[PDB]
Design an enzyme around this catalytic site. Sequence first.
Site, mmCIF file in Angstrom:
data_model
loop_
_atom_site.group_PDB
_atom_site.id
_atom_site.type_symbol
_atom_site.label_atom_id
_atom_site.label_comp_id
_atom_site.label_asym_id
_atom_site.label_seq_id
_atom_site.Cartn_x
_atom_site.Cartn_y
_atom_site.Cartn_z
ATOM 1 N N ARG A 14 0.829 -1.200 0.000
ATOM 2 C CA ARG A 14 0.000 0.000 0.000
ATOM 3 C C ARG A 14 0.858 1.241 0.000
ATOM 4 O O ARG A 14 2.038 1.203 0.360
ATOM 5 C CB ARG A 14 -0.955 0.037 1.201
ATOM 6 C CG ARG A 14 -2.043 -1.023 1.197
ATOM 7 C CD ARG A 14 -3.303 -0.551 1.894
ATOM 8 N NE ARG A 14 -3.909 0.549 1.117
ATOM 9 C CZ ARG A 14 -4.726 1.444 1.607
ATOM 10 N NH1 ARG A 14 -5.210 1.341 2.848
ATOM 11 N NH2 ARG A 14 -5.067 2.484 0.862
ATOM 12 N N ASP A 48 -3.787 -1.673 8.305
ATOM 13 C CA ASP A 48 -2.860 -0.633 8.769
ATOM 14 C C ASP A 48 -2.138 -1.065 10.047
ATOM 15 O O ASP A 48 -0.965 -0.762 10.214
ATOM 16 C CB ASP A 48 -3.649 0.617 9.056
ATOM 17 C CG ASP A 48 -4.121 1.412 7.844
ATOM 18 O OD1 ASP A 48 -3.538 1.222 6.743
ATOM 19 O OD2 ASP A 48 -5.021 2.233 8.032
ATOM 20 N N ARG A 95 -7.063 15.501 1.253
ATOM 21 C CA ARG A 95 -8.108 14.480 1.317
ATOM 22 C C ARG A 95 -9.289 14.997 2.143
ATOM 23 O O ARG A 95 -9.099 15.577 3.203
ATOM 24 C CB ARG A 95 -7.533 13.226 1.981
ATOM 25 C CG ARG A 95 -8.577 12.186 2.306
ATOM 26 C CD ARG A 95 -7.958 10.922 2.882
ATOM 27 N NE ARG A 95 -8.984 10.011 3.336
ATOM 28 C CZ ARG A 95 -8.743 8.802 3.816
ATOM 29 N NH1 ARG A 95 -7.532 8.307 3.809
ATOM 30 N NH2 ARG A 95 -9.760 8.073 4.238
ATOM 31 N N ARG A 106 -12.946 2.611 -3.915
ATOM 32 C CA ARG A 106 -12.130 3.696 -4.519
ATOM 33 C C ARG A 106 -11.798 3.406 -5.972
ATOM 34 O O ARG A 106 -10.619 3.451 -6.398
ATOM 35 C CB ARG A 106 -10.912 3.953 -3.678
ATOM 36 C CG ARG A 106 -11.250 4.561 -2.339
ATOM 37 C CD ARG A 106 -10.153 4.414 -1.368
ATOM 38 N NE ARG A 106 -10.368 5.150 -0.152
ATOM 39 C CZ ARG A 106 -9.560 5.067 0.889
ATOM 40 N NH1 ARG A 106 -8.539 4.225 0.876
ATOM 41 N NH2 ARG A 106 -9.750 5.855 1.928
ATOM 42 N N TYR A 117 -4.814 4.701 -3.589
ATOM 43 C CA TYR A 117 -3.749 5.669 -3.410
ATOM 44 C C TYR A 117 -2.843 5.738 -4.644
ATOM 45 O O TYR A 117 -2.719 4.767 -5.405
ATOM 46 C CB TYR A 117 -2.918 5.371 -2.172
ATOM 47 C CG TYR A 117 -3.522 5.747 -0.836
ATOM 48 C CD1 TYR A 117 -4.889 5.584 -0.528
ATOM 49 C CD2 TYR A 117 -2.709 6.296 0.139
ATOM 50 C CE1 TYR A 117 -5.378 5.944 0.725
ATOM 51 C CE2 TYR A 117 -3.190 6.643 1.385
ATOM 52 C CZ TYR A 117 -4.551 6.484 1.676
ATOM 53 O OH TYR A 117 -5.070 6.828 2.863
ATOM 54 N N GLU A 131 -2.115 1.985 -6.338
ATOM 55 C CA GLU A 131 -2.597 0.741 -5.748
ATOM 56 C C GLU A 131 -3.499 -0.022 -6.712
ATOM 57 O O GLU A 131 -4.448 0.530 -7.260
ATOM 58 C CB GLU A 131 -3.360 1.054 -4.467
ATOM 59 C CG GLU A 131 -2.444 1.606 -3.389
ATOM 60 C CD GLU A 131 -3.122 1.817 -2.055
ATOM 61 O OE1 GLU A 131 -4.301 2.244 -2.009
ATOM 62 O OE2 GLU A 131 -2.423 1.618 -1.006
HETATM 63 C C1 LIG Z 1 -0.992 5.954 9.269
HETATM 64 C C2 LIG Z 1 -2.277 5.398 8.733
HETATM 65 O O1 LIG Z 1 -3.057 4.784 9.461
HETATM 66 N N1 LIG Z 1 -2.528 5.595 7.435
HETATM 67 C C3 LIG Z 1 -3.679 5.056 6.737
HETATM 68 C C4 LIG Z 1 -4.768 6.113 6.585
HETATM 69 C C5 LIG Z 1 -5.296 6.593 7.932
HETATM 70 O O2 LIG Z 1 -5.737 5.524 8.761
HETATM 71 C C6 LIG Z 1 -6.382 7.585 7.786
HETATM 72 O O3 LIG Z 1 -5.914 8.688 7.002
HETATM 73 C C7 LIG Z 1 -6.942 8.051 9.103
HETATM 74 O O4 LIG Z 1 -5.934 8.663 9.931
HETATM 75 O O5 LIG Z 1 -5.922 5.551 5.909
HETATM 76 C C8 LIG Z 1 -5.676 4.735 4.869
HETATM 77 C C9 LIG Z 1 -6.872 4.615 3.937
HETATM 78 O O6 LIG Z 1 -6.792 3.714 3.073
HETATM 79 O O7 LIG Z 1 -7.842 5.373 4.102
HETATM 80 C C10 LIG Z 1 -4.467 4.244 4.546
HETATM 81 C C11 LIG Z 1 -3.260 4.510 5.388
HETATM 82 O O8 LIG Z 1 -2.451 3.352 5.560
#
Ligand SMILES: CC(=O)N[C@H]1[C@H]([C@H](O)[C@H](O)CO)OC(C(=O)O)=C[C@@H]1O
Length: 379
Positions: A34, A59, A243, A306, A339, A358
């Site tokens: 990812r 995550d 975002r 997505r 992403y 991705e």
């Molecule tokens: C550090 C971390 O957790 N990054 C993750 C991010 C995050 O959880 C979210 O922005 C809320 O903080 O979300 C996602 C997602 O696919 O939406 C992927 C990332 O891996």
Amino acid sequence: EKSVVFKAEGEHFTDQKGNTIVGSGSGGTTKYFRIPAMCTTSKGTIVVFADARHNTASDQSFIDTAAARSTDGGKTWNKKIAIYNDRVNSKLSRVMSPTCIVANIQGRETILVMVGKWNNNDKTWGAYRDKAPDTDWDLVLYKSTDDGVTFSKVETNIHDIVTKNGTISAMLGGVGSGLQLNDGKLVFPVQMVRTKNITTVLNTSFIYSTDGITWSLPSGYCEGFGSENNIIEFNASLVNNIRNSGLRRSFETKDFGKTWTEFPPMDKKVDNRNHGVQGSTITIPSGNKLVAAHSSAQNKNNDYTRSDISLYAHNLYSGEVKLIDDFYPKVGNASGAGYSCLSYRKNVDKETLYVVYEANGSIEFQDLSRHLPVIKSYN
Ligand SMILES: CC(=O)N[C@H]1[C@H]([C@H](O)[C@H](O)CO)OC(C(=O)O)=C[C@@H]1O
């Protein structure tokens, strides 16, 4: 029409001692990738980072930062781990969410890559607001001065400036690429989780440096939204592109991060629908004008799949927006999808526009250079 950078259930990495990392993919491969980040160097070399999620797409899992390097225009890739997690917790130790910069640092072409690091936290990072900062968190920076062949840790003051601020539980790069300003300053867009007493949970900002060692935070904050963001330099502003569930948000600062105001040419111009998604935003010259190129998902199913990761052009003068290429016109894997990261370069007279993204647990690459005339004309 494309290449696979990192193949889900198709890669075998080694650890620092040279022992194979037995993941949960078939055959002991790394299960899932990812969060890609890319740059292109003055030699034409392409370097791609990603979360190598050895056991699961989650995550909160065991993750290293992989790096892939191509010297043939993205046809083939040499791979390694660039940043290892601390190996405290076999389930949870992780480095996450790369943000990279290729920069001229006092004459030396350098690739910087910054990732967050956790060990024992079993929840998402936004859950941890009691401490300034969270004791499980760190934000680490690695560099290469050999065109991406070798990476080494950079000793910084980033943890110190977060501690000194006293209102930040954790900080993370904005995901994808940072930038080097025309004056040479290095800038990483950042996401921050504020301490519990702050009424905003999330903010966006940036950190800046001259040498890559000593960093600073500006005094102000931008509204957080979904916090992942990139910054461009335009017309005497730094402009972010953030975002957000639904319509993406864009703010500008004219005072180097003291205050932020909405940036009409990009604010609310692209819809990512439910949950939002990370997106990549960069500039591309056209004469003495600039165009913004942006990638993010159309999200036709309004969910974590997505779908339809797409390239847009933003006319920074008129505010027009148009779709250039739906380069991944597919429903993603809701375990983790959507992403992307763009990279533009002009080396001599050769202009390149690349993307990584991705694709069902893999990271794919495309050469989007054929679109450059259409993008550049959008001014
Ligand atoms: C550090 C971390 O957790 N990054 C993750 C991010 C995050 O959880 C979210 O922005 C809320 O903080 O979300 C996602 C997602 O696919 O939406 C992927 C990332 O891996």
